[PDB]
Amino acid sequence: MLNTTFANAKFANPFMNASGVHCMTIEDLEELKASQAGAYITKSSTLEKREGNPLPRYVDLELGSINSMGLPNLGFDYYLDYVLKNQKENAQEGPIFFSIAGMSAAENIAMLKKIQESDFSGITELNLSCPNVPGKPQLAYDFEATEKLLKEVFTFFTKPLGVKLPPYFDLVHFDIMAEILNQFPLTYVNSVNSIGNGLFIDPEAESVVIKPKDGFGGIGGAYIKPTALANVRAFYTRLKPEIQIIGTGGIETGQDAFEHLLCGATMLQIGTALHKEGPAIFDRIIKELEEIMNQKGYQSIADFHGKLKSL
Amino acid sequence: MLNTTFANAKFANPFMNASGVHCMTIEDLEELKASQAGAYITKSSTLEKREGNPLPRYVDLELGSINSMGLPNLGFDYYLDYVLKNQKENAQEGPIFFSIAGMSAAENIAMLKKIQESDFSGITELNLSCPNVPGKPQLAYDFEATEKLLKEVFTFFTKPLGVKLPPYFDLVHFDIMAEILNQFPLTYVNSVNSIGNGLFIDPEAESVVIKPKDGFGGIGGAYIKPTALANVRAFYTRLKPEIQIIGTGGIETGQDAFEHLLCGATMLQIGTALHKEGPAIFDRIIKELEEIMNQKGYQSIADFHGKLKSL
Ligand SMILES: Cc1cc2nc3c(=O)[nH]c(=O)nc-3n(C[C@H](O)[C@H](O)[C@H](O)COP(=O)(O)O)c2cc1C
Ligand SMILES: Cc1cc2nc3c(=O)[nH]c(=O)nc-3n(C[C@H](O)[C@H](O)[C@H](O)COP(=O)(O)O)c2cc1C
Ligand SMILES: [Mg+2]
Ligand SMILES: [Mg+2]
C-alpha cells in the first residue's frame, strides 16, 4: 500500500525520522534500519565534533516540544564513514539520507565537495534553517545568500540534493523561493524545520524551561502542523515537478500523515513524536495510514497524493 | 489587583478584545463596554466599507482557529463617528482604541490625517500585519517599507500611536525592527497578529475548511502562544521603555495572561478565546489571574511584570 518512489529510488513506505531525532550515533541509526521506517536520515553534521548547547535543551510539551540543541553531532567524517560502510552491505531498500548543516557557507561547500568526491550514492540534505545556533540567522530567510550559495553548489555537486527549509508565512516568500529553487537540478525540498525562536514558560517557577538563548527554542509537534501543511502545499503548487517534497511537521497519527500526502508530500519525516515514542512509532503510524486508506478504498498513495480539494 | 497604567492612561485591568473579534458593529462595541474588559478596540478599518472574503472564512479548531476574513468592516467614517460620540459621554475608565489597516500606505496616511485633524483623544493602532487580504503582503515583513511609512506618519501624527505586528521567528528580525521602532515617539507595539498562512484540512472530505485563498488562513489560539510569548519577550528586552507592549496570542486562562505579563506585556488582547466564549470571558479570566496572584501573594502586576527568569 505505501510503496513510494522518490528521487528515482524505491522505498517500502514514505516514513522517516526527521534529522536531529534518533539519529546521533551509529546505534541510533541501526535502530532506525531495524524499524519499519521506509527510510532514515543522519543528524545534521558540521565539519568538526560539537558538544552543542548547555542543558536543559529539549523539553516535551503537551502540544509538542521545544529545543535548542545547538547542533550536537559526532562530526562529518563519522557520519560519512557510517553511510559508506552501510551501502556496501546492501542491507536495506533504498538509500540513506545524509544531512549537513555547516556553520558557514564555506563549511557547507567543503562538506559538499567531500560527498561528491566520495563513493556515497545516497541522498544529501543541505540544512539551511538551523535556528538553535547563537549568532547564525537561518540562511533560508536571506534570499540573496540562499541563491548565491546554491549557484555555487550546483557548479560541482551532481549527486541527489535536497534542502531543509524553515517555515514561511507570507505567500510572496513562497514565490521568491520557488523562483530560486526552480532554476536548479534539486531533487527535493523538505518543509518544515522548527517554528523558530518560540518561548515556553513554567508559570510556577516563573521561568523559561531551556537554558540556551534565554529559553528561546524551535517549536515542533501539533503546534506547527498548520504551518507545515501550508508550507508543503504552497511549494507543491509552485515547484517544478522534478523537485519533489518531504513533508515534516506535526506528524503523529495516520491522519496527520494523510494530510501531508494530500498536500503533495512524497516522503514524511517524524521528529517530536518519534522522540517521545521511539522507533516503534513507524509500525503504529503505518497501520493507521493503511486503515484510513482501506476505509476510503484506496490501495496506493497515488489515489490521493496531492489531491487536497479547495472549496 | 489588576489596575494598570498604559499610554499615560489608567485602566481597571489589562484585558481587551483583540481587533477583529467582537468589535465590528456599534452593538458589538457596546457589549465590550458593558463587559469587564479593562479596555477595547475597534475592528481594523479601511477608507471604504468592505464585505470581506467569501464564506466560510472562520473556523473553530480544537487548538485554536483559522480565518481569512478579508478585512470586513463598516468603514473608517463609521468607527470614527462612534468613538467621537463615545468620549463625549465619559462613560468608561480609559480611552477606546481605534484600529486602522489601510490597503495601501497612502490609505493609512489619509486615515491617520483624518484622526489627527479630528478631536479623537484615544489610542490609535496601525495594523501593519493583516495576512488575509489577497495580493497584499504583511508590510511589517518588509523593513524598508515599514520604516518609510513610519517616518512619513511621524512628520504629522502627534497623538498616541501603536503598531500591530506580525510574528517574527529570527532574532535578527527582532533587532532590525527594534532599531526602526526606537527612532519614533511610538506609544506601543502589539505582538502578535495571527500566524500567517497556515492551512487546516478536513481529512474525511479531503479539503480545506475555508474558501478564500485555497484554505490558507491566519492561525490563532493555543497553536501560537509560544510564538506570541517569544515576540512579546523579545521586543521587551529590545524596545526603549517609552514604547510599551500589548501581548496578543493564545490567551485563554489566567495562566496564559500571567505568562504574557511576565514577558513584559502591559495590556493583553484576547481573540480566538473571546470569539468562542463571548464577553463573559473577561470576568472569568480576571478571576483566574487574581487567584494566581493570591496563591503567590502578589497584590499588584508590578510584582512580576517583566520578571521572566532565564535558567
Ligand atoms: C531534538 C531536535 C533536534 C533537531 N535537530 C535537527 C537537525 O539536526 N537538523 C534538521 O534539519 N532538523 C532538526 N530538527 C527539526 C526536525 O527535523 C523537524 O523539522 C521539526 O522537529 C518539526 O518536526 P516535528 O513537528 O515532527 O517535530 C530537530 C528537532 C528536534 C526535535
Ligand atoms: C476573526 C479574526 C479577525 C481578525 N481581525 C483582525 C484585524 O481586524 N486587525 C488586527 O490587528 N487583528 C485581527 N485579528 C488578529 C487578532 O487580533 C489576534 O492578533 C490573533 O487572533 C491572535 O490572538 P488569539 O490567539 O487570541 O486569537 C483577527 C483575528 C481573527 C480571529
Ligand atoms: Mg527497516
Ligand atoms: Mg466595562
Residues A203 and A69: their CA atoms lie apart, in Å, by 23
Domain count, chain A: 2
In angstroms, rounded to a whole number, what is the distance separating the alpha carbons of residues B12 and B5? 9
Report which DSSP code applies to B73. B
Q: How far is CA B50 from CA A209, A211, B46, B111, in A?
A: 44, 48, 8, 16
Are A40 and A17 within 8 A, CB to CB? yes
DSSP H or E run through A153: helix A143-153
What is the span of the domain harbouring residue A268?
1-52+71-194+221-311
Query: Measured between alpha carbons, how far is residue A89 from residues A77, A121, A301, B185, B227 in Å?
Result: 19, 13, 30, 67, 45
End-to-end CA distance of chain B: 29
CATH (domain of A58):
2.30.26.10
Instruction: Tally DSSP H helices, then E strands, for chain B.
Output: 9, 15
Q: B278: which residues sit within 8 A by CB, 6+ positions away?
A: B22
CATH number at residue B37: 3.20.20.70
| Strand order, beta sheet including A216-220 | A58-61, A64-67, A216-220, A195-199
CB B274 within 8 A of CB B305: no
A149, A104: one domain: yes
Those residues with Cβ within 8 angstroms of residue B251's Cβ, 6 or more apart along the chain or in another chain: B225, B257, B260, B268, B269, B270, B273, B285
The C-alpha atoms of residue A79 and residue A44 are separated, in whole angstroms, by: 9
Cβ(A97) – ligand 1 distance below 6 Å = no
Residue with cell 519614533: B184
| Distance (Å) from CA B133 to ligand 4 centroid | 32
CA–CA separation, A149 and A142 (whole Å): 11
What's the reported resolution, in angstroms, to a tenth? Answer: 2.3
Domain shared by B201 and B306, yes or no: no
**Rounded Cα gap, residues B205 and B263, in angstroms:** 41
What's B75-122 look like in SS3? CHHHHHHHHHHHHHCCCCCCCCEEEECCCCHHHHHHHHHHHHHCCCCC
Residues A164 and A299 in one domain: yes
Pick the residue of A66, A129, A169, A208 with the most B CBs within 10 A to test the interface with B by mutation.
A169
Longest Cα pair distance anywhere in chain A, in angstroms?
A: 55
Tell me, yes or no, whether A240 and A311 share the same domain: yes
Same domain, A7 and A94: yes
The DSSP bridge pattern shows strands B201-202 and B207-208 to be antiparallel
Cα A16 to chain centroid, rounded: 9
Does A306 contact chain B (CB < 8 Å)?
no
From CA A114, how far away is CA A226, in angstroms rounded? Answer: 37
Distance CA A17, CA A262 (A): 20
Distance set, CA A226 to CA A162, B219, B260 (Å):
22, 8, 23
Q: By 3-state DSSP, what share of chain B in percent is helix, strand and coil, each rounded to 5?
A: 35, 20, 45
Picking from A306, A297, A224, A292, the residue whose alpha carbon sits closest to that of residue A254 is A292
A91 & A202 share domain: no
Method: X-ray
Same domain, A300 and A204: no
Task: Please tell me whether residues A62 and A97 are part of one structural domain.
Answer: no
For ligand 2, whether the C-beta of B272 sits within 6 Å is yes
Does residue B40 share a domain with residue B120?
Answer: yes
CA atoms within 13 A on the CB side of B262: 25
Compute CA distances B296 → B9, B134, B285, whole Å: 27, 47, 17
Q: Look-up: residue for cell 481529512?
A: B203
Cell numbers that stand for B190 in this block: 502589539
Q: Select from A137, A229, A258 the Cβ nearest to the Cβ of B199.
A: A229
Q: Which three cell numbers stand for residue A297?
A: 478504498
Cα separation, B250 vs B246, whole angstroms: 13
Taking the centre of ligand 4 as the mean of its atom positions, its distance from the CA of residue B32, in whole angstroms, is 6
Cell of B50: 468592505
Whether residue B206 sits in one domain with residue B279? no
Do B306 and B277 fall into the same domain?
yes
Query: B185 exposed, middle or buried (CB, 10 Å; 0-12, 13-18, 19+)?
Result: exposed
Number of CB atoms found within 10 A of residue A48's CB = 11
**Is B194 marked as binding a ligand?**
yes
* Helices (H), ranges, chain B: 26-34, 76-88, 105-117, 143-153, 171-181, 225-236, 254-263, 272-277, 281-295
- Where on the phi/psi map is residue A130: left (φ > 0), alpha (ψ -120 to 50), or beta? beta
Tell me how crowded residue B287 is: count the other CB atoms within 10 A of its CB: 12
